[PDB]
Design a protein around this ligand. Structure first.
Ligand SMILES: CCCCC/C=C\C/C=C\CCCCCCCC(=O)O
Ligand SMILES: CCCCC/C=C\C/C=C\CCCCCCCC(=O)O
Ligand SMILES: CCCCCCCCCCCC
Ligand SMILES: CCCCCCCCCCCC
Ligand SMILES: CCCCCCCCCC
Ligand SMILES: CCCCCCCCCC
Ligand SMILES: CCCCCCCCCC
Ligand SMILES: CCCCCCCCCC
Ligand SMILES: CCCCCCCC
Ligand SMILES: CCCCCCCC
Ligand SMILES: CCCCCCCC
Ligand SMILES: CCCCCCCC
Ligand SMILES: CCCCCCCC
Ligand SMILES: CCCCCCCC
Ligand SMILES: CCCCCCCC
Ligand SMILES: CCCCCCCC
Ligand SMILES: CCCCCC
Ligand SMILES: CCCCCC
Ligand SMILES: [K+]
Ligand SMILES: [K+]
Ligand SMILES: [K+]
Ligand SMILES: [K+]
Lengths: 257, 257
């Protein structure tokens, strides 16, 4: 009966969390959304009057442009898809369950293969992350024992603190670049780092697609390394925080009698 | 030395997997991509020549258009963003690490709150999924024991088969509702179900975004229920497959000498 009670309590808490978060986000964003819509409407009306084009013609043109954008066309210069390195980027985003969405299959045959490829590849990456976490814990214990100089394994709290420090350091080091190389502000770089590392992958900000990219050989390698390390660290941090949340749920169950 | 060897072997296998997948995907998609780009360029040239406009003006118009798409401006009658229901949809996509990208924060203050909200909310959902898997295993064991009529825990193989059957049934039932209500084919519905349930979330196909949606009261509830169950089932299946892959790696290491 304890397991059922804990399951029910967690479900209720998550429901309340979702309701409160929705109310806060709506209050934060509604005015900006309305202002942006009004600005777009004014711009469309001004263009229409400017060149006397009909509304339906503009709607057809915009539908064609949406279809083109679905295939990779952008107003700025961007790297080609599916050559050999765009495919590598795509499969990397797929196996890590990031899913930026900048590149998606569009043919029958590429969607069946996508299903089978993901079905065979996501568990391997999950296992890799788990093995990385185990190795990190072992090496942390070894360093701690050597510094003090088996039963020297650190507590969960210290592991959480170390993971937080590592995540902050990796994010700041990655954000040191990404800023001057692609016209981004430091806060935007930190936001992109958090969105990519947590495997949410909104897709509003995606790195390393500007056609010519100066050196472009070392930059792609550095991007790959940074994303790999960040994803590993954030995955480990989330697992530790989940353990702590389960302990807190047990405590609140005990208190309620 | 066994753990280090296993880590190195898994890394090498993943690297080879990525290279092969990149080659196959490029071979599958390059021709389609090029043809789509040529079609877009022909359409743009025809529009420019027909209405005697200039390319720079069209580039400016297209730059203005994309900025609206980020506020959520579409060509076919989408539902409003950042209302209470839209905010609920957004937070639901956030806490599950799906990240469709159809709705993203645009103001300073909503991104700090986004970071803190995700940092506190993703581990809770991970814990919920783990508790669901434990409860499912317990109920499966109880059902099997009662049918035969503690020590009646099913093996990993049977759990994997049951999870596969459940995932297939849930996907086919969600597709049987998505296909008529949306303008989608059955295969497209199955592809969308796989992409959403695995928490990849490309964002090319997103459901329940068509403004007036007939009844629209039961439809949103059914969408919520279907996505929740599918995500739970696919998470459990991925964990079981990861365990099996680890066993296979152990066998590979033992055989090689
Ligand atoms: C040593 C391999 C370890 C296993 C790898 C596992 C998962 C891969 C994770 C993240 C990769 C994200 C895509 C980055 C590719 C950028 C390349 C480019 O900029 O073009
Ligand atoms: C009993 C619930 C507790 C567990 C909840 C955990 C995670 C939520 C997971 C997935 C929700 C995906 C978003 C679906 C919202 C659709 C609403 C709409 O169509 O407008
Ligand atoms: C230019 C770098 C991207 C092309 C593919 C590189 C894959 C190997 C990098 C990881 C080292 C094994
Ligand atoms: C249409 C429903 C949107 C608001 C979400 C709450 C109702 C559904 C889930 C409630 C489960 C307790
Ligand atoms: C590891 C520390 C070096 C990373 C920052 C380099 C700055 C790059 C832009 C000049
Ligand atoms: C101009 C910046 C190129 C990237 C340098 C970083 C390479 C070493 C990272 C480990
Ligand atoms: C078993 C419930 C799933 C089937 C729903 C069918 C809906 C048809 C849409 C018109
Ligand atoms: C006509 C739209 C049908 C939506 C309801 C589907 C069944 C609800 C139970 C999950
Ligand atoms: C009687 C046990 C509670 C079941 C309710 C369903 C929880 C989602
Ligand atoms: C353009 C370089 C192709 C990838 C090289 C792979 C070497 C291991
Ligand atoms: C004993 C080798 C462990 C390697 C850890 C490497 C972390 C980047
Ligand atoms: C074009 C330079 C390749 C950089 C990769 C370095 C190999 C470890
Ligand atoms: C002594 C083994 C080192 C392993 C390095 C692995 C790099 C990801
Ligand atoms: C706009 C009607 C939905 C309000 C949520 C009700 C939750 C019990
Ligand atoms: C009493 C055990 C609860 C399990 C219910 C699972 C609901 C899908
Ligand atoms: C507008 C009807 C709401 C249906 C959901 C209620 C289920 C408890
Ligand atoms: C957190 C209580 C509900 C907020 C208003 C819908
Ligand atoms: C599968 C080995 C790589 C061949 C294509 C570059
Ligand atoms: K994602
Ligand atoms: K996305
Ligand atoms: K994800
Ligand atoms: K995504």
């Amino acid at each position: 009966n304890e397991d059922n009670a804990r399951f029910l309590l967690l479900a209720a808490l998550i429901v309340l969390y979702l309701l409160g978060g929705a109310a806060v986000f709506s209050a934060l964003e509604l005015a900006h959304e309305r202002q942006a819509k009004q600005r777009w409407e004014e711009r469309l009306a001004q263009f229409s009057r400017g060149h006397q084009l009909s509304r339906d013609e503009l709607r057809g043109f915009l539908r064609h442009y949406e279809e083109a954008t679905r295939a990779g066309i952008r107003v700025d210069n961007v790297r080609p898809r599916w050559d050999f390195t765009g495919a590598f980027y795509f499969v990397g985003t797929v196996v890590s369950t990031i899913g930026f969405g900048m590149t998606t299959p569009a043919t029958v045959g590429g969607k069946i293969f996508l299903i089978f490829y993901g079905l065979v590849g996501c568990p391997s990456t999950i296992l890799f992350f788990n093995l990385f976490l185990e190795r990190l814990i072992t090496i942390i214990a070894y360093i701690m024992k050597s510094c003090h100089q088996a039963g020297w394994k650190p507590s969960v709290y210290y592991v959480m603190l170390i993971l937080c420090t590592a995540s902050i350091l990796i994010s700041c080091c990655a954000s040191a670049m990404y800023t001057p190389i692609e016209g981004w502000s430091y806060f935007d770089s930190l936001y992109f780092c958090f969105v990519a590392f947590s495997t949410i992958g909104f897709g509003d900000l995606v790195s390393s697609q500007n056609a010519h990219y100066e050196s472009q050989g070392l930059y792609r390698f550095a991007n790959f390394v940074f994303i790999l390390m960040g994803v590993c660290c954030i995955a480990s941090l989330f697992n530790v925080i989940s353990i702590l949340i389960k302990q807190s749920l047990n405590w609140i169950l005990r208190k309620m009698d």
